[PDB]
């Protein structure tokens, strides 16, 4: 069937507002985590986060941004970048039935859902709520707020799957190409950063709380003293395009998506089973006869999660353990946006020939012994890379990207 | 490619807690709309809704329901019904890599999102919030909360697209079968009903507010005196299965999904363009050699929406107009769950050979000129039915179902 390639990327993350800033951060192992007075003032135990360092004010037309929440704003800016990077003119992707968009978020906008409820209970009621809360709070906000302004005429919807969200968006975009239904599909996601959402994770003990005095060291995937993930926000978008279509217009191709896995654990609501991830990676590797040169793990920096994933990796590769690094150690967990941002970090490593370090490992977990966990920036000619995304509800997604000749 | 059929269904709506109660309501043209003290007390102008009349207490095991919000609860009950109706047992669908689930909601859980923030802001903080809010508030709540307890091992994620949500879930399930990736996929969705979410629509002016004294007459699609939709809650689930697999086990087949359309308006954020709807219906009709006998339109019961759809239908069919009925006139708008519930209402009409009536039409709109709008339960031998679902962000979905030869 049809082949799908990535011809453009865009990103707004805690470690950079474009692919160049991100490239630099990755090579330097630079942390994007900072102290958050907002989280502390909210009464949380976790006082750190991967915030987007950028004032989005005035970057989007007023009549457009009025319907958007932060998730949508980050994704929108990422898409603008992706379009430019892919070299697509308005006439090339706009008002085109064969051009679609699949992008989502993990929780829509808790901030605006809370805003509406707070306003409604106030002295003004409906007048305080305003007529723009629905498009900001609905789960499809990220896709609705981008499809409309970018004049998308093809597929238009969001895939939501907790922390695997934007990973499934990319995979579904590949499926549209494979089914011959679309020539181009913009795929990615976004996630806002706020105490309204973060506190829920702290209430279940999922966030790091013992490193508030040293923010850049809180996220420490694979470290014996890890104590939870560091929440983050941001966005990402990639241009998934049919191969022949990309070649015909002389598009720059980062890589082909040669493998996409999507499975379910059918076990625990918030803890990974490991068994599902094994099937997910194996599914993504079906027909891929080239070895995996680098694996961008889920590496949440949680006690149980990091362990279950290393076990799954051992089962899949055994004595064929590939190089591994967890970028979340420096970026934090952007939840719904993690999938696309991590695929982008992987594409950058593949494009520039290097492996980003898995930082903050002062004492390697005993269950990670024997694995090839890269802890220092290492230059290397990569050809095939893998990126895993796992979320609550036992949802698993894996993407395999490979350079073209 | 492979063919997909519906071998089972389950539903929990304002007009019935199962397919029998729904069938009884559709035949009688009974309304599920009632006066809501909750909405009135919140300060809203709309005082009516299509609530689920069912005491869900004790219907789901304690350990499982503790992670669920109302949208998940409704979808869960619908899935239990669908499994039994399909004649499937644990040994056949559990722990099976070729059995998946695609189901979502329009906005996760505004109630628990607000509950979390309210609790956190209280003197107890994190202790008051509890450790179960994430799975209740996240957008993928519906898929996560069903795939886990039902031990699903295949595909697992939610698709969100506002009022087209559950319609795209079904379409995506069909795609999994066509790609040969799954033999069975449970598809559908659910949506909670609460002022927290309802007030956002009211502040938007999208809800009916001139018939609070006569609830059952508030939702009046195509009526010249319509003034917005009536919000509703509920769930729905259908079993999408590969044809040979279904025939091999001697399953009961309601109909085959012979058409699926998914397009984008790329125009207005909250108003339909019509142009997108035309392309969507045409896409679903492509290849169908049989004419459309019945059409379960979107019929939101809104001034602009109704007009735009009628025009689109007129553009697609023209003189050869099929029987048209807007079930939302009696059920209300269940948003994220509207797609699957309407697909179900249509399957029941096709299964029981009859057309549901479009109630509350005291004065037909000028736009519905040369169109066959059924306003009374009519017995007919339907063969091919169509259902349209449109949502904010200009997202369109259309499903075409036909009896198996
Ligand atoms: C990743 O799997 C962890 C869960 C992320 C879900 C997306 C964010 C939902 C938060 C909603 C408010 C509690
Ligand atoms: C249908 O298109 C109208 C919009 C429905 C959006 C999904 C329902 C939830 C909206 C946000 C609630 C906080
Ligand atoms: N990853």
Question: How far apart are the CA of A397 and the centre of ligand 3, in A?
Answer: 9
Backbone CA torsion sign across A217, A221, A227, A231: positive
Number of H helices, E strands in chain A: 16, 14
Question: Is-contact A328 A249, C-beta < 8 A?
Answer: no
Q: Contact B117/A110, CB-based, under 8 Å?
A: yes
- Residues ≥6 apart with Cβ < 8 Å to B397: B161, B164, B167, B168, B171, B260, B261, B262, B280, B339, B388, B389, B390
**Is A203–B279 a contact, with Cβ atoms under 8 angstroms apart?**
no
Sign of the CA dihedral running A239, A244, A248, A253: positive
Which of A97, A140, A267 lies nearest to residue B395, judging by beta carbons?
A140
CB within 8 Å: B138 and A392: yes
Torsion on CA atoms A189, A193, A197, A200, rounded to nearest 10: 110
Please name the residue whose Cα sits nearest to atom 10 of ligand 2.
Answer: A138
Beta-strand pair B384-391/B395-402:
antiparallel
Q: How far is B60 from chain A (nearest CA, A)?
A: 15
Cβ contact A162–B262 (<8 Å): no
Q: Which ligand does the CA of B135 lie closest to?
A: 1
b/e string for B298-316 if b means 16 or more Cβ within 10 A? bbbbbeebbbbbbbbbbeb
Nearest to B137 among A94, A107, A264 (CB): A107
At the top level of CATH, the class of B6-259 is: alpha beta
CA dihedral B59, B60, B66, B68 (to 10 degrees): -90
- A282-289: long-range contacts (C-beta < 8 A, 24 or more apart)? A282/A316, A283/A259, A283/A398, A284/A259, A284/A260, A284/A386, A284/A398, A284/A399, A284/A400, A285/A259, A285/A261, A285/A316, A285/A386, A285/A400, A286/A259, A287/A258, A287/A259, A288/A258, A288/A259, A288/A384, A288/A400, A288/A402
What CATH code is assigned to B260-405?
3.40.47.10
Where do the structural domains in chain A lie, given as residue ranges? 6-259, 260-405
Q: Are B147 and A404 in contact (CB under 8 A)?
A: no
In chain B, the N- to C-terminal Cα span, in Å, equals 18
Nearby residues of B290 by Cβ (< 8 Å), 6 or more positions away:
B383, B384, B402
User: Does residue B155's CB lie within 6 angstroms of at least one atom of ligand 1?
Assistant: no
The CA-atom distances, in angstroms, between A183 and each of A98, A155, A249, B145 are: 6, 11, 12, 34
CA of A207 to the centre of ligand 1 (A): 12
Q: Is A158 in the pocket of ligand 3 (CB under 6 A)?
A: no
**Whole-angstrom distance, CA of residue A185 vs CA of residue A170:** 9
The beta-carbon neighbor of A154 closest among B114, B120, B263 is B263
Residue pair B243/B256 in contact by the 8 Å Cβ criterion: yes
Per CB-CB distance under 8 Å, the chain A contacts of B153 are 263-266, 276, 279
Q: Which of A250, A89, A246, A235 is nearest to A182 (CA)?
A: A246
Measured between alpha carbons, how far is A48 from A33 in angstroms, rounded to an integer?
A: 7
Q: Quick check: CB of B201 below 6 Å from ligand 2?
A: no
Ligand 3 mean position, distance from CA B365 (Å):
54
For the CA of B111, the nearest ligand: 2
Nearest chain B Cα distance for residue A142, angstroms = 9
| Nearest C-alpha in A relative to B41 | A121
Q: Please give the distance, rounded to the nearest whole angstrom, from the Cα atom of residue A141 to the centre of ligand 3.
A: 24
Rounded Cα distance between B327 and B300, Å, is 9
User: Do strands A354-355 and A156-160 pair parallel, antiparallel, or not at all (unpaired)?
Assistant: unpaired
User: What is residue A147's three-state secondary structure?
Assistant: helix
> At what resolution in Å was this solved?
2.0
User: Do residues B71 and B190 touch, judged by C-beta distance below 8 A?
Assistant: yes
A318, two tokens: 């055994």
DSSP string, A180-192: TS-SEEEEEEEE-
Beta strands in B255-377, from DSSP E residues, in sequence order: 255-264, 294-296, 323-325, 354-355
Burial class (CB in 10 A: 0-12, 13-18, 19+), A366: exposed
Among B94, B101, B134, the residue with its CB nearest the CB of A392 is B134
Chain B residues near residue A264 by CB distance under 8 angstroms: 100-101, 147, 152-156
| A203/B126 CB distance under 8 A | yes
Out of B148, B159, B393, closest to residue A159 by CB: B159
Q: Given an 8 Å threshold on Cβ–Cβ distance, is B162 in contact with A138?
A: yes
Q: Which of A105, A113, A138 is the best mutation target for the ligand 2 pocket, counting ligand atoms within 8 Å of the beta carbon and taking the most?
A: A138
Residues 6 or more apart in contact with residue A14 via CB below 8 angstroms: A32, A33, A49, A50, A51, A52, A53, A232, A233, A234, A331, A332, A334
CB-side neighbour CA atoms (13 Å) of A151: 9
User: From the CA of A365, how many Å to the nearest CA of chain B?
Assistant: 27
CA angle B46, B48, B51 (to 5 degrees): 135
Helices B110-120 and A195-202, axial angle in degrees (round to 10)? 80
Residue with tokens 């492979």: B2
| Angle separating helix axes B110-120 and B195-202, nearest 10 degrees | 110
B342-345 long-range contacts (CB < 8 A, ≥24 apart) are B342/B167, B342/B296, B342/B387, B342/B389, B343/B166, B343/B167, B343/B170, B343/B236, B343/B238, B343/B296, B343/B387, B343/B399, B343/B401, B344/B9, B344/B11, B344/B19, B344/B22, B344/B236, B344/B238, B345/B22, B345/B26, B345/B296
Q: Which of B44, B161, B276 is the best substitution to test chain A (most A C-beta atoms within 10 A)?
A: B161
Residue of B46, B160, B171 for testing the chain A interface, max A β-carbons within 10 Å: B160
Residue B256 bridge partners (DSSP): B5, B402
Q: How far is CA B191 from CA A255, B72, B161, B232, B341, in A?
A: 39, 8, 13, 8, 11
Classified as helix, coil or strand, B379 is: strand
Q: What are phi and psi of A311, to 5 degrees?
A: -65, -45
Q: Is the CB of A116 under 6 A from ligand 1?
A: no
- Please give the angle made by the CA atoms of A355, A360 and A364, to the nearest 5 degrees: 90
The residue of chain A with its CA nearest to that of B148 is A266
Q: Which phi and psi angles does A326 have, rounded to 5°?
A: -110, 105
Torsion sign across C-alpha atoms B48, B54, B59, B62: positive
> What Å distances lie between residue A61 and A56, A57, A87, CA to CA?
11, 10, 22
Rounded to a whole number, what is the distance in Å from the CA of B44 to chain A's nearest CA?
7
Instruction: Please check whether the two domains, B6-259 and B260-405, share a CATH topology.
Output: yes
Token pair of A230 as six digits: 């560091």
Q: What technique solved it?
A: X-ray
Q: Do residue A42 and residue B200 have CB atoms under 8 angstroms apart?
A: no
Is residue A78 within 8 Å of residue A56, measured between CB atoms?
A: no
Q: Which two tokens stand for residue B26?
A: 């559709």
Q: Cβ–Cβ of B263/A97 closer than 8 Å?
A: yes
Count of Cβ atoms closer than 10 Å to residue B324 Cβ: 24
The residue whose CB lies within 8 Å of the most ligand 1 atoms, and thus the one to mutate among A71, A114, A199, A335, is A335
> Residue A10 is encoded by which pair of tokens?
């865009």
Best residue in A132, A142, A393 for a mutation probing chain B (most B CBs within 10 Å): A393
Distance of residue B141 Cα from the nearest chain A Cα, in angstroms: 8
Using an 8 Å CB-CB cutoff, list chain A residues near B107: 108, 113, 137-139
Which of B271, B189, B165 shows the shortest CA–CA distance to A67?
B271
Look up residue A226 and give its two tokens: 């890890």
- Contact in structure between A75 and A84 (CB atoms under 8 Å): no
């Amino acid at each position: 069937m049809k082949r799908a390639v990535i011809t453009g990327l865009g990103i707004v993350s805690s470690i950079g507002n474009n692919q160049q800033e991100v490239l630099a951060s990755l090579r330097e192992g630079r942390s994007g985590i900072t102290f958050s007075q907002e989280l502390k003032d909210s009464g949380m135990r976790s006082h750190v986060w991967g915030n987007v360092k950028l004032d989005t004010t005035g970057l989007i037309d007023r009549k457009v941004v009025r319907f958007m929440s932060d998730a949508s704003i980050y994704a929108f800016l990422s898409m603008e970048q992706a379009i430019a990077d892919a070299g697509l003119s308005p006439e090339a992707y706009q008002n085109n039935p064969r051009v679609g968009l699949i992008a989502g978020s993990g929780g829509g906008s808790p901030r605006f859902q809370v805003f509406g409820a707070d306003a409604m209970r106030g002295p003004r009621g409906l007048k305080a709520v305003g007529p723009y809360v629905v498009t900001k709070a609905m789960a499809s906000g990220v896709s609705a707020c981008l499809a409309t302004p970018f004049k998308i005429h093809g597929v238009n919807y969001s895939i939501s799957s907790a922390c695997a969200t934007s990973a499934h968006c990319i995979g579904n975009a590949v499926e549209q190409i494979q089914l011959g239904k679309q020539d181009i599909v913009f795929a990615g996601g976004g996630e806002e950063l706020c105490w309204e959402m973060a506190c829920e994770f702290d209430a279940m003990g999922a966030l790091s709380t013992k490193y508030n005095d040293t923010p850049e060291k809180a996220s420490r995937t694979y470290d014996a003293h890890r104590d939870g993930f560091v929440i983050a926000g941001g966005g990402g978008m990639v241009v998934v395009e049919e191969l022949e279509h990309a070649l015909a217009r002389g598009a720059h191709i980062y890589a082909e998506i040669v493998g996409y896995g999507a499975t379910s654990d059918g076990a625990d609501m918030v803890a990974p089973s490991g068994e599902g991830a094994v099937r997910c990676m194996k599914m993504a590797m079906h027909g891929v006869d080239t070895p995996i040169d680098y694996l961008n793990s889920e590496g949440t920096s949680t006690p149980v999660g990091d362990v279950k994933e290393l076990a799954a990796i051992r089962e899949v590769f055994g004595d064929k353990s590939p190089a591994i690094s967890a970028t979340k150690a420096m970026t934090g967990h952007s939840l719904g946006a993690a999938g696309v941002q991590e695929a982008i970090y992987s594409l950058l490593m593949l494009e520039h020939g290097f492996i980003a370090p898995s930082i903050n490992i002062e004492e390697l977990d005993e269950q990670a012994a024997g694995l090839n966990i890269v802890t220092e920036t290492t230059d290397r000619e990569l050809t095939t890379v893998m990126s895993n995304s796992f979320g609550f509800g036992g949802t698993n997604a894996t993407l395999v990207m490979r350079k073209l000749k």
